[PDB]
Ligand SMILES: [Ca+2]
Ligand SMILES: [Ca+2]
Ligand SMILES: [Zn+2]
């Protein structure tokens with residue numbers, strides 16, 4: 225299986241597999257059984273403002289999720305990405321639905337890494353700022369049943385029957401270019417993101433959650449990940 | 462023939478095909494016969510600092526090269542990047558030699574595009590800063606006989622014959638990810654570069670020049686390019 229680390233914005237409560245009793249933010253290390261969880265308000269179709277940092281000088285993997293006039297979902301778990309995730313990786317978005325409906329529309333996504341030639345020897349980058357996901361964006365390897373375009377949006381669902389998001393569908397948004405990590409040139413790459421989303425209510429008690437993974441450079445939708453496995457993990461342990 | 466726009470840092474006069482009697486910085490629009498040239502000093506084994514911009518607030522395609530304690534060769538030619546070059550490109554580096562030897566070591570490279578999602582509203586980017594070319598740099602699509610690693614260097618010659626780099630060698634260094642240009646969301650894509658090279662004196666009239674192109678998304682070595690075709694042109698037209 226592909227070694228994969230995500231920050232799950234899960235919306236279906238799974239006290240079966242370690243998701244808490246409430247719709248939560250979660251931080252996954254090679255398992256859907258997460259490390260930290262936090263209560264999240266989860267307003268309806270509104271805007272998005274999520275954020276991820278991992279500064280190896282502080283070695284925390286923090287995150288927030290902010291609506292307007294809401295609060296931050298601090299889910300900072302202490303994990304070292306030295307040994308738990310491969311040398312060259314492939315960041316991207318993951319979304320899913322199953323037996324319910326919920327909207328998985330991304331409106332903008334960004335990134336910035338800064339990785340240590342010899343710390344003050346002019347660290348590298350892979351910054352990008354996709355605010356305007358177009359129709360034929362050919363630097364994305366969107367897998368699954370994910371689509372793009374039709375507005376400035378990233379529609380990570382089979383959609384548009386009045387947007388009614390067509391349950392049991394999986395969508396991924398793998399970015400095209402790799403990122404050097406392992407430690408090896410040490411791992412101070414404070415890789416930032418911004419994860420603006422719009423989880424609109426279909427009036428259905430909406431629940432299956434969006435993610436933000438960091439996979440291996442080779443991946444797929446492994447053997448069925450529609451549902452509580454949430455788009456990227458093969459196994460529920 | 463792939464559509465390609467390059468900045469020849471030509472270290473050899475090619476009077477048969479329009480290169481001037483002096484070694485020169487150049488500029489190319491689907492042509493090894495350059496639009497505009499300027500005198501370049503072409504020092505021995507030293508370092509580097511080149512820089513290429515195209516801001517459509519002024520629509521000038523500029524290029525400057527400066528050693529430390531040397532001058533700058535502004536070779537700016539107004540050309541309309543609207544129609545002369547496709548929507549999606551694959552930028553990179555190109556260097557070659559033939560019947561005379563020269564070292565074409567690149568030791569750092571950057572790029573920074575900024576194209577108008579909606580002019581104020583948070584334009585896109587592709588900033589990277591490769592100061593630490595590794596032995597197994599898997600985000601380069603280095604073609605031909607390009608080598609890398611063994612130091613912090615990008616050796617675009619078959620090298621290590623005591624730095625006498627095995628004449629009629631050629632090697633390209635295409636970056637891994639595409640860039641949106643054509644117009645469509647108009648063409649303020651102020652792509653930057655920083656192109657610190659090293660051209661070692663072989664005691665052999667160092668010659669055949671390094672390039673920096675903006676090609677088609679599909680490319681290779683065109684029909685043999687060890688020489689006047691400078692690594693990226695099929696024909697002398
Ligand atoms: Ca769930
Ligand atoms: Ca030439
Ligand atoms: Zn969860």
Ligand SMILES: [Zn+2]
Nearest residue numbers: 469471480487
């Ligand atoms: Zn020339």
